[PDB]
Design a protein around this ligand. Structure first.
Ligand SMILES: CC(=O)c1cccc(-c2cnc3ccc(NCC4CC4)nn23)c1
Length: 338
């Protein structure tokens, strides 16, 4: 269905010639096009699957982009600019400015090797600045993950290394933009039950205690530790295991969240229902240690990052640091020297 309409050489809306695939999600596909009606400018086109759910998410995304782009026409807060949208054989296609690689693709293709601290600081700052602007405008992203943070530019170099039989990519400039408003929710709109991709889901989302701007802050915390290590500290699929991993890495869950939740399946009285002395239990234990033991250095700038990471992963969303305050954290002082 989608396969039949996203081929190299295909022409969309009598101007956009597909030259390459940039990526794939559950929503569908992102393709690189030459725009023959804008002097041959390369753009990005999100082709949405002709399914009810993804169609309605795409109409929702278009509405959010019109708002964010109108409010911030210079993209000072780094949300991707939408150029226009059309229908091609029943599929909604959204045209955007072409950006470079996802942070996900860059880490994955370098063999899950982390970003440098200097790069992470700049990227964290821009991610917080961009998501804080959604926060100012009565939005929650809900689906922040490395796949949805793209480098503005192809500002990197690439060489084949025959020792390890892949390309290695070296970042020059780490500037990013935030993409995918398919899930973004206004404060007064109906809130989805489940939101976020398992690895980046806040404990208030897992426990169905209600969610808000603070669930984004949790996701950014998870992104930052993945950028620093090259992998997530929550490598799991299952909800309970995910909660076991939070206990190991971050310390016990607040009793009030455990007792308030209707998600009682996960618990037994006051505590996670988790045989730690079992095979799957000892496995989680091996994979997990207190957060600050992931630090690769005791240098103070590593202490700075992990203090912010720890405040972003506060269990209680009423307590969790805001992006307004995260922007002011000591980790960022290095960017504001003068
Ligand atoms: C994934 C998504 O929703 C999205 C939305 C708007 C624009 C883009 C976009 C713009 N330029 C590019 C260049 C690469 C790209 N990669 C897709 C991400 C998923 C790994 N997406 N992309 C992606």
């Amino acid at each position: 269905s989608m396969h039949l309409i996203c081929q190299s050489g295909d022409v969309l809306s009598a101007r956009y010639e597909i030259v390459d695939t940039l990526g794939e999600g559950a929503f569908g596909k992102v393709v690189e096009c030459i725009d023959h009606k804008a002097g041959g400018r390369h753009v990005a086109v999100k082709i949405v699957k002709n399914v009810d759910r993804y169609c309605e998410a795409a109409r929702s995304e278009i509405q959010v982009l019109e708002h964010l782009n109108t409010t911030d026409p210079n993209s000072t807060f780094r949300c991707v600019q939408m150029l226009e949208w059309f229908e091609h054989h029943g599929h909604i296609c959204i045209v955007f400015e072409l950006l470079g690689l996802s942070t996900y693709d860059f880490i994955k293709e370098n063999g899950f090797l982390p970003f440098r601290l200097d790069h992470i600081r700049k990227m964290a700052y821009q991610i917080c600045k961009s998501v804080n602007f959604l926060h100012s405008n009565k939005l929650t992203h809900t689906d922040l993950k490395p796949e949805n943070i793209l480098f503005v530019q192809s500002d990197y170099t690439e060489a084949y290394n025959p020792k390890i039989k892949r390309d290695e990519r070296t970042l020059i400039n780490p500037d990013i933009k935030v993409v995918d408003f398919g899930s973004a929710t206004y404060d007064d709109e109906h809130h989805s039950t489940l939101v976020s991709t398992r690895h980046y889901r806040a404990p208030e989302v897992i426990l169905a205690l209600g969610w808000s701007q603070p669930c984004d802050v949790w996701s950014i915390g998870c992104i930052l530790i993945e950028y620093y290590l090259g992998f997530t500290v929550f490598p799991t699929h299952d909800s309970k295991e995910h909660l076991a991993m939070m206990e190991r890495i971050l310390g016990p869950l607040p009793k009030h969240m455990i007792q308030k939740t209707r998600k009682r399946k996960y618990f037994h009285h006051d505590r996670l229902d988790w045989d730690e002395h079992s095979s799957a239990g000892r496995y989680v234990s091996r994979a997990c240690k207190p957060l600050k033991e992931f630090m690769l250095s005791q240098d103070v700038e590593h202490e700075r990052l992990f203090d912010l990471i720890q405040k972003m992963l506060e269990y209680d969303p009423a307590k969790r640091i805001t992006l307004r305050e995260a922007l002011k954290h000591p980790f960022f002082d290095l960017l504001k020297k003068s």
